[PDB]
């Protein structure tokens, strides 16, 4: 299953990069927004299971790609992406509430416990 999700992730990333390099004003945005909704759905599928230590490495990577691609296309951030980050962090905590500051403090203590997803956390 992780196989399929991971593959989907990879496929969509590569699609995005292809539109990045090649493409017209129209076709670029078409493939981008296509990959975007792929990633949404994948997020939602992964957000549909309880916690899963082995899934988080993707979840964090995917939400990263989602935020990046979202922000890039919009040519700016929003607060939706703040709440996306909030959701992913809530999830990290639920493995083992108040606000972003306490969340991050508890999360980075839970990272010094050495779950090997630091390369995603640091990205986050």
């Amino acid at each position: 299953c992780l196989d399929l999700w991971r593959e989907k992730n990879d496929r969509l990333v590569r699609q995005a990069k292809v539109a990045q390099n090649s493409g017209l004003t129209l076709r670029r945005q078409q493939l981008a927004q296509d990959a975007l909704e792929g990633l949404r759905g994948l997020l939602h599928s992964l957000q549909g299971l309880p916690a899963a230590v082995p899934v988080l490495p993707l979840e964090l990577t995917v939400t990263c790609n989602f935020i990046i691609l979202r922000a890039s296309l919009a040519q700016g951030f929003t607060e939706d992406q703040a709440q996306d980050i909030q959701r992913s962090l809530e999830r990290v905590l639920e493995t083992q509430e108040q606000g972003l500051r306490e969340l991050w403090d508890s999360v980075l203590r839970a990272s010094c416990l050495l779950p090997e997803l630091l390369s995603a956390l640091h990205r986050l």
Binding site: C1, L49, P50, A52
Partner: protein, 74 residues
């Protein structure tokens, strides 16, 4: 209890939930459910050929991951 029987039969297998039930080709009558990690072939979900017969499949039902969250099957 069936018409054709007229008798109160007990289910031999000890299950929690019966998320789906019904007739399938070659088997006659069937229940989904369970008894009591990310491998598609593990499944944690026994089919049961009704009238206290063989489990009949434990091979390619839904993953055990999803086994905690699912409430209904169609």
């Amino acid at each position: 209890i069936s018409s054709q029987t007229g008798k109160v039969v007990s289910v031999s297998g000890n299950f929690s939930s019966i998320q789906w039930a019904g007739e399938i080709e070659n088997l006659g009558m069937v229940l989904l459910g369970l008894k009591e990690d990310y491998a598609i072939w593990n499944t944690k979900f026994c089919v049961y050929s009704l009238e206290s017969q063989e489990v009949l499949s434990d091979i390619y039902i839904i993953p055990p991951a999803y086994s905690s969250v699912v409430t209904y099957v169609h």
